[PDB]
């Protein structure tokens, strides 16, 4: 029972990381200083600057659900 309660802690702390990041970095990132002008949900800013796939805060929520399901599992 010890190892699982700690493995559960892995889920909550990293699931929070994905969602907290998508919130605080919602207004802007160094890769995209103005996310606020675009919106909550947009696909990307293009292949420039090395690639900008899955930056928006919607894409953070999108990735957390995989961890939500893993954690609850």
């Amino acid at each position: 029972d010890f190892l699982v309660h700690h493995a559960i802690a892995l889920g909550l702390h990293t699931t929070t990381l994905i969602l907290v990041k998508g919130a605080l970095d919602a207004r802007g990132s160094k890769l995209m200083p103005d996310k606020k002008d675009f919106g909550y949900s947009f696909p990307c800013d293009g292949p420039g600057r090395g690639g900008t796939c899955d930056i928006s805060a919607y894409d953070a929520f999108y990735l957390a659900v995989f961890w939500m399901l893993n954690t609850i599992g």
Binding site: P33, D34, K36, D37
Partner: protein, 141 residues
């Protein structure tokens, strides 16, 4: 340019057997594009849709369904063969529009006649937050 060149809809086309990347029902109903240029000899070039074709000495004419298909060919001719193409837009009603060298000079060269459009006099960033414009459209304009 000095004056817009009107369209000559009856000019010889290149020697091309045909393909499946041609025009669809959208062309007859909505709009289609045509490109003109003048070559000094008989050469071979890659088409955007399909394979290879043989130009003809003198004027040449093609018909495309997209503007990108036309400008893709201009970049090939301006670079490889160093020519000066010009293409139009034809609607279903028969109306014709002269698009790309609209001033006669290509867009990558300045000209005194042009007037600026969509020019913000500020730095990127440095603009109001969305809350200020929360109930109408636009934070960038």
């Amino acid at each position: 340019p000095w004056k817009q060149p009107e369209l000559d809809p009856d000019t010889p086309s290149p020697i091309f057997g045909g393909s499946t990347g041609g025009l669809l029902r959208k062309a007859q109903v909505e709009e289609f594009y045509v490109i003109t240029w003048e070559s000094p000899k008989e050469q071979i070039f890659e088409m955007p849709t399909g394979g290879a074709a043989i130009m003809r000495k003198g004027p040449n004419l093609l018909k495309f369904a997209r503007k990108e298909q036309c400008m893709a060919l201009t970049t090939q001719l301006r670079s490889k063969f160093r020519q000066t193409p010009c293409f139009y837009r034809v609607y279903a009603d028969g109306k014709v529009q002269y698009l790309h060298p609209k001033d006669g000079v290509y867009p990558e060269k300045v000209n005194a006649g042009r007037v600026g459009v969509n020019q913000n006099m500020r730095s990127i960033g440095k603009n109001v937050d969305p809350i200020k414009v929360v109930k109408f459209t636009g934070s960038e304009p």
